[PDB]
C-alpha cells in the first residue's frame, strides 16, 4: 500500500450541504430583489448569532440574506453586461467582505439611522486595538480574573493550567492546590495591537471592551433603479 494520509474518524449526525443550497440562495436573492424595493448591501463582519437573531428580530419586517459572497454577487450578476435590474453592477462590485443583503421596502433614512444606533458590546477584538489594561495579581487566579469582588468569585479550575501555560505562554505552577502564578503578568494595555494570544486571554478572562456596530455600504431603490452610497461606520 502507498504511504498516504488517512482522514480522522468522526461519526456524527449532520451531513455536508451541496450546490443545491447555493442554487436555492441564488433563486431566493433574485426573487427577494424582485419583491423588495430597498436592497441594502451591508458588511456584518464579526458578529455572534445572538446579536443577529436580535437585529433579525428588530427589523422583523424585512428580509436578510447572509449567504456566500461570490454566490450573492453571481445572483446580483456582477458581470458588467449582466443584471437582474438596471445598473446593479455598482452594488454588485461593492461587496468585498462577509457581505449581507438586507432587502426592505419601508424607509430610506430610518433604515439608515436606527442602524447607526444598534451597537452592543463584543469580544476582545482580535484584529483591532483594546483599551482596558488588565494585569492579574500575584496570588491564586480566579474565574473572573481580577474582574469580580474578593470572596464573590470562584478560583480557576485545575484542568486549564496546561492551556494557560502551553498555549498562552503565561508562567504558572500549581504549588498548593490551585493555579497561583508567582508574579503579576500584564496581558494587554491601552491603544496597542491586540494579538491573537491577548484576545484569547481576554476572552478566557471574560472581558468585553470592544463594541460591535453595523456598517452599511449602500442601499439601492428598485423603483428609481439607483444605489445611494453611505459610510455609516
Amino acid at each position: 500500500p502507498r504511504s498516504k494520509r488517512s482522514k480522522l474518524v468522526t461519526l456524527a449526525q449532520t451531513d455536508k450541504k451541496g450546490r443545491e443550497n447555493k442554487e436555492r440562495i441564488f433563486d431566493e436573492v433574485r426573487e427577494a430583489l424582485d419583491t423588495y424595493r430597498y436592497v441594502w448591501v451591508l458588511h456584518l463582519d464579526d458578529v455572534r448569532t445572538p446579536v443577529l437573531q436580535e437585529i433579525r428580530t428588530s427589523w422583523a419586517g424585512s428580509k436578510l440574506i447572509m449567504g456566500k459572497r461570490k454566490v450573492l454577487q453571481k445572483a446580483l450578476g456582477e458581470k458588467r453586461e449582466e443584471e437582474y435590474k438596471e445598473n446593479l453592477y455598482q452594488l454588485s462590485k461593492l461587496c468585498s467582505g462577509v457581505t449581507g443583503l438586507l432587502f426592505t421596502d419601508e424607509d430610506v433614512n430610518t433604515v439608515k439611522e436606527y442602524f447607526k444606533s444598534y451597537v452592543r458590546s463584543d469580544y476582545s477584538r482580535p484584529n483591532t486595538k483594546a483599551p482596558l489594561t488588565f494585569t492579574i495579581p500575584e496570588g491564586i487566579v480566579y474565574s473572573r480574573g481580577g474582574q469580580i469582588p474578593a470572596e464573590e468569585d470562584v478560583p480557576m479550575i485545575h484542568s486549564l493550567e496546561p492551556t494557560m501555560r502551553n498555549k498562552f505562554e503565561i508562567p504558572t505552577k500549581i504549588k498548593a492546590g490551585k493555579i497561583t502564578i508567582d508574579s503579576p503578568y500584564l496581558v494587554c494595555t491601552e491603544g496597542e495591537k491586540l494579538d491573537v494570544r491577548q484576545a484569547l486571554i481576554l476572552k478566557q478572562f471574560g472581558i468585553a471592551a470592544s463594541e460591535f456596530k453595523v456598517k452599511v455600504s449602500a442601499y439601492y431603490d428598485n423603483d428609481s433603479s439607483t444605489v445611494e452610497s453611505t459610510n455609516i461606520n
Partner: protein, 191 residues
Amino acid sequence: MKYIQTEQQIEVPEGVTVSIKSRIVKVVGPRGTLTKNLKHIDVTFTKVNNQLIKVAVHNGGRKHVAALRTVKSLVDNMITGVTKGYKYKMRYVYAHFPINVNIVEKDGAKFIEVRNFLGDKKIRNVPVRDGVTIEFSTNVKDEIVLSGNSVEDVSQNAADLQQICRVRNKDIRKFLDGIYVSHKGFITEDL
C-alpha cells in the same frame, strides 16, 4: 511516473549572502556564518536574481522528489538562524530535592553539571556544543536559556540535557521531576 522537472524556491533577504559551489552551502549574515555539506542529494541550485535561489530535480522518482522540500527547509533554517537566531527555554521541576545546575569548565570545555537530581550522589555532566550559549534567566525561577545560530545544535543540546535526567524504576505518574523544553522561538523575537 518519473516527472520531468520539479523545482522549489528559496527567497533570500537583503543583508545575507549565500555561496553554493558543489552542494556546499555557505550563508553569511548579520549574526555569523553557517555552512552545510549537501553532497548526498543530487539536486541543482540556480541563482535567478540576487534575491531568489531555485533548486531543481530532473527526471526524478518519488523517493528522489521527496528530498527537494527537505533541502529547501534546511537552507531556510540556515538563513533564519543567521538573521534571527534560535532561543530555547527549559524549565526544571522537583518535588523534594532541589536540583542544582551550574556551568563548569573541566579542562576548558564548558559542561553543564546537574547534581542532587532526586537525591542522587551522582553528578551528571553534559557538554555545551560549539556555538550554543547557555544563560540562566533571572526573574524566572528554575529556567535555562539556550541560544544559537544552528537550530540543529541548539535542539540537540536541549535534547540531551533533557535525556540526561530521566526517572528509572519508578512510577512516572507520581515522580514529576526533571527538565523540560517549554518554548522554542527566536533571539530577535520580532522584526
